[PDB]
């Protein structure tokens, strides 16, 4: 599970 | 096309409190990651703390040093996130900064807002003289002539100026404002025109100093 | 636990530049990097992502790589408009807050050098009723960003009483500055003519005010 960013926004898993 | 308009900056006494809201539009609000990043006088970034979407929890995080004296809230309603300040120190005195932030198939965006000045401190707010700078005789002369406002004595930051309602846009230089050993700010904004409209042409410059509720439209004669 | 940078670089235009971070294994190493451009005065604005990922509508000069704890970015065909601090950024996972980098100054070399235009203003009359003279001496349009200002009293150096500004950068990617004197308006009135004196490279651009 990937976040980013400041507002570690979701974005995609492995 | 996205914009992040922040605001509610300005000048607070030690041990006081703020808000800021930051407004953002060209996003779909709901879906956005909300967070605010500051930067304290001529150093580097400092994150503050982050706000997750509806969607998730909701729920903020925070950076240890302001931890339980700040926080950040939104208003899916109004399009707006939060930043509220209590118990201010010095330290905290900076800009600040929020970003918005989506996913739209599988591609990050993330945009900042211009930024807010918070300056805490125990010092008194003091709105501008605003005075015209008329060119001479010997400028006057030349093919083009460059006239002008002095911002005189003011605190804290900012100060905006634009010309004849921001109709005027070119050849116009507004100056970075120099601190003064009184801690009072002054700067000068010029305007470069042609020499023969020193007649029919009117020019005012509109400067506006929010924290001291003055904003003045100066004309500038010869 | 901290994102360490080199504070400056450095390298003519047309060129490419590359600048380094390097975190831990908490940072990192465990997450991923972002890159920010920090032109002065304006906002911050994200160039790179998750490592390698370009931000929507950045010049694909631009580009970035992960290695390890470390980090990369680098820029190509570089223009004026290039010179800003660059940041790096990640999650760290012992202290849970986004950590930025150091910051780096990157300068480019090899820019035409332009010589200053100087404005001088006499006091307005309207300051002068409150007896309090103020002498406005603008700067712009000049490379490298080192002035000296020095203000004259008919041929008397003018010491006191006297403010310059830091230069400062423009949307033209030349340099600007203001020196203002500040006076009483019987002082003001004490002298026939004022003048102030401003030096750049080796060449001196003198303009004048009398009362």
Redesign the interface.
Known sequence: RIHIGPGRAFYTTK | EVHLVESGGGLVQPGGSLRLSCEVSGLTFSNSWMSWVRQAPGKGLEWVGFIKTKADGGTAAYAESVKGRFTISRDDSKNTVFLQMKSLKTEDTAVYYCQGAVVISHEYIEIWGQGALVTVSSASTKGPSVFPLAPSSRSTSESTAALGCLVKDYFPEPVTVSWNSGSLTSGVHTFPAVLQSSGLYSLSSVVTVPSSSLGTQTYVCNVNHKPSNTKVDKRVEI | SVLTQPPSASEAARKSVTISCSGGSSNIGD??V?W?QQVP?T????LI??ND?R??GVSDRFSGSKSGTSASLAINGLQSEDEADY?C?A?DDS?????????TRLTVLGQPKASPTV?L??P?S??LQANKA?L?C?I?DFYPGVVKVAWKADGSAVNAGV???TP?K?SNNKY?????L?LTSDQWKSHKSYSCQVTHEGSTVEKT?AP
């Not at chain 3, 202290?95 to 910051?103: E, K, V, W």
């Open positions: 997450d991923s972002s920010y005065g906002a911050p604005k994200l992502y998750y990922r931000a929507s940041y950024a999650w202290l849970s807050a986004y950590i930025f980098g150091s910051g404005t203003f006499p307005s309207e300051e103020t406005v603008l712009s403010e310059t500004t400062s423009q600007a500055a203001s020196s203002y500040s005010v």
